[model samples]
Target chain A: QVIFDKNVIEFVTVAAEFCAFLERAESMKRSTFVDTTLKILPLLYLKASMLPKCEMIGDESPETYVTEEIYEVLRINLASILAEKDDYLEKKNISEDLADIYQDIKDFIFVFQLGLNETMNDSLAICQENFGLLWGQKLVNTMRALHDVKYS
Target chain B: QVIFDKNVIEFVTVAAEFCAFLERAESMKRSTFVDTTLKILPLLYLKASMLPKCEMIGDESPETYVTEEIYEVLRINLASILAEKDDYLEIKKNISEDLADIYQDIKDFIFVFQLGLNETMNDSLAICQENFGLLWGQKLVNTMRALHDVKYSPKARL
Candidate 1:
């Protein structure tokens, strides 16, 4: 059993939607992008926080679906959209912060959809740890950075 | 002028959306209701937390739009939607009761916001922030936990 609770299922839907949304950033206006992120990022953070405490159940780590090349392109497109508003605290650019968050979440979505319960478990464990340790803060700071961009 | 920062404006937007969402609760399917709430509640909590602190500056109290009749209708609709899951950790409180409780406060805040008077709006925001610290913030999260369970409950999956 996945036993991840509906929170995990809900997290999957949100992460998947977030990735798809980012993929289209090249076509979105700055106002739309910032306003939308302001709406979704908080949900993203909260979903990640509510995920059950997970432990590794597999010997190998989860496979990576989002490669460096993929991330660079995502970052480039977003940075282009964000232009001078790209930079934020604790990181060089909000584009990189978002792409960084996207990477692990994208991979978690990858493993989760595969339906191998063990790998999903480990993937989730790693993803939550990463959230607790890394991208979560990036997401918050990016919100602050973007709030300033919108307000200023 | 709105006389508030983008943060305050954002909270206003979120609060308005929440009221509208609750209005639709009567028609929404349980799955959609739970999932949509799972999406909004966190953002609601986050937006509320981001608001700047304020001290009430006006002598007049803000107006209230969610009358008891309005609140009773909201409470009953959500209670109907939540059903058995409605009552949780209650000294007899239900999710609908708390949600309607928040809606009362937030709905009042929204009405004051539309008045276009800076002094009254400032005082309302102060009251809203204080309510956040005291009641609705607790209501939102407690309801979140209850909603989380319903989200995964077998019937919810259907």
Candidate 2:
């Protein structure tokens, strides 16, 4: 129950299919869908790396995306712990790991972003404007499950 | 830049297109080539609204979606001040407006969750294994614009 349920999984499948669409492109055939999909991974990593810097976040936190209050709680708690310990060995270690994961993800997707941003912009230029209710949850569920620390 | 340069209007356009596909009865409809598009609002709000009391999770705040640290920053620095200090009538009023907006967003899309949650779950069964990056700037940019707090927030109270 603590973990994401089935719908979250479906979102990921769509994303993967989306990625596969890009990967299957003939010599990176330039299409808006393919291009925009390509930007997803790297941009996600950028946001991931910024997570540890927030100072309030926990090792495995889920409140990061949907709501903002937990972040404040973590920040206050983290600050107190640091003040008492005088050295945040544990916090530093966690951040280092988070950073490493972020780097790895970014590096993995670097090629995708470099090759796709302009094309994504172009494709997005032609994107539609109607909206649904829970679309952000798709991104949230997808991005949050990127790592084990994220899922729990 | 990690984010799209388009304003919320443009982002909403893209979001709408994406959801139109989502709204389809099946993954493929009206010929394989017919692209489906939809606004992000209905889909997102539906997802949030459909949650049973047990599923509603805000305690962890951003971690409910983002990460612990990001959640922490939001909680300590932003939550209280943002909750208490909006120029709108009073901070309580603003927060209520914000929460009401959240509520309405959920209400608008509740049926989508009922109809699609089972399907969505099936789709994501194996995806937890892969790496998904930030997804923020794109989301917020589109969201800030399309789901303008004024319209939907009050709609919730109704």
- TM-scores for candidates 1 onward, in order: 0.56, 0.21
Expressed as tens digits, the lDDT of each residue in B1-158 for candidate 2 is 10122332243343344334333323343223111111243233222222222222223211122245533443343224333322243112333233223322222223232343443322221111111112322232233322233222334342
Looking at model 1, residue B140 earns an lDDT score of 73
lDDT of 1 by residue, A1-152 (tens): 44468989999999999998998878589988987887677788788867777877768677889988999999999999998888854357889889999988898899888877778888888888777446765665566566557654
List residue ranges in candidate 2 displaced over 4 A. Answer: A1-42, A45-97, A105-152, B1-6, B29-158
lDDT of 2 by residue, A18-85 (tens): 43442343333223322343245334322221221112112332111212353344334333332332
Instruction: Fill in the DockQ of model 2.
Output: 0.02
Where model 1 places Cα greater than 4 Å from the true spot, the runs are: A1-152, B90-92, B153-158
C-alpha RMSD by candidate, in order = 12.0, 22.9
Number of clashes in model 1?
A: 0
Candidate that would win on TM-score? 1
Candidate 1 docking DockQ: 0.10
Sequence-dependent TM-score of model 2:
0.21
